[PDB]
A paper describes a structure:
Physiologically, β2m is degraded in the kidneys; DRA patients typically suffer from kidney dysfunction that results in β2m accumulation in the serum following dialysis. Following our previous approach, in the present study we engineered a β2m homodimer where the DD strand interface is specifically locked by a disulphide bond (linking the engineered C33 residues of two β2m molecules – DimC33). Therefore, the unprompted dimerization of S33C implies that in solution, under native conditions, the DD association interface spontaneously brings together two monomeric β2m molecules, and only once the DD interface is properly assembled, the two facing Cys33 establish the disulphide bond, which results in the formation of the covalent dimeric species (DimC33). In summary, our study presents an engineered β2m covalent dimer, DimC33, displaying the same biophysical properties of wt β2m in solution, such dimer mimics the first oligomer formed during β2m aggregation.
In order to assess fine details of the molecular structure of DimC33, two crystal structures of DimC33 were determined to 1.9 Å and 1.4 Å resolution, hereafter named DimC33_low and DimC33_high, respectively; additionally a crystal structure of DimC33 in complex with ThT was determined to 2.8 Å resolution, and named DimC33_ThT. The three crystal structures display three different space groups and crystal packings. Overall, no major structural effects on the β2m fold are induced by the S33C mutation, either locally or globally, in all DimC33 structures. The covalent DD strand interface is structurally well conserved in all three DimC33 structures, where it maintains the same contact surface of 560 Å2. It must be noted that wide intermolecular packing contacts through the ABDE sheet are established also in the absence of ThT. In the structure of DimC33_low (present work) and in the hexameric H13F mutant17, highly hydrophobic association interfaces are built via facing ABDE sheets (surface areas of 805 and 970 Å2, respectively). Although such two ABDE assemblies are not superposable, the two interfaces are structurally similar and residues Tyr10, Tyr26 and Tyr63 are clustered in their hydrophobic cores. Notably, an extended ABDE interface between facing β2m molecules can also be observed in the absence of ThT in DimC33_low (this work), and in the hexameric β2m structure reported earlier. The reciprocal orientation of the two facing ABDE β-sheets displays a high level of variability, but in all cases ABDE β-sheets face each other and the same three aromatic residues (Tyr10, Tyr26 and Tyr63) build the hydrophobic core of the association interface.
Residue numbers in the entry:
A (entry chain A): 0 to 99
B (entry chain D): 0 to 97
Write the structure that this text describes.
Amino acid sequence: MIQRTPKIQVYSRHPAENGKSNFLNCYVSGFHPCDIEVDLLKNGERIEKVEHSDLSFSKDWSFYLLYYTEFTPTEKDEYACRVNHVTLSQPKIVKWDRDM
Amino acid sequence: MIQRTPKIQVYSRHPAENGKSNFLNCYVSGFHPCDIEVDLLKNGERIEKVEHSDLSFSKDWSFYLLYYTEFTPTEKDEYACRVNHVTLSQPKIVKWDR
């Protein structure tokens, strides 16, 4: 497989509501090679106990990986996913759109 | 060292009986880093139609990956698993033994 840079989706499990518990997700996909670093951020700082799936792929070694954690959004807090990969010269930061 | 060379096991789901439908498996495990190439081979040639698990994280910080394929063995056909990994000087071929 050739080098391929990741696609990134950030989304919550349920329709977001301030003060209500939820799950925050970062899905990284279509990438190669498999080594990748992903943080979920709250107000720009790393969230510590985030979990992830295994590395999925179909016919080719083009990889798919989900990072997720419980969270309770509030009006003041903003969330993001930060991804580093060999294809990336600097970390890529994708903000969470509240509507997703 | 955090690099770990893959353990490679090649085995059929049932013991070998020419003519009966079976499964060929290559279980590659205990490796680090995750970057790896695994191919199932029939007579030295890559089998195009194969199945596999996720490339999976172990509790000891290593990885594993299973490749498998439906096949029907015969007396002539020979099978192997080829694995390439940073810890190996050249691709490693491990033959299947009935």
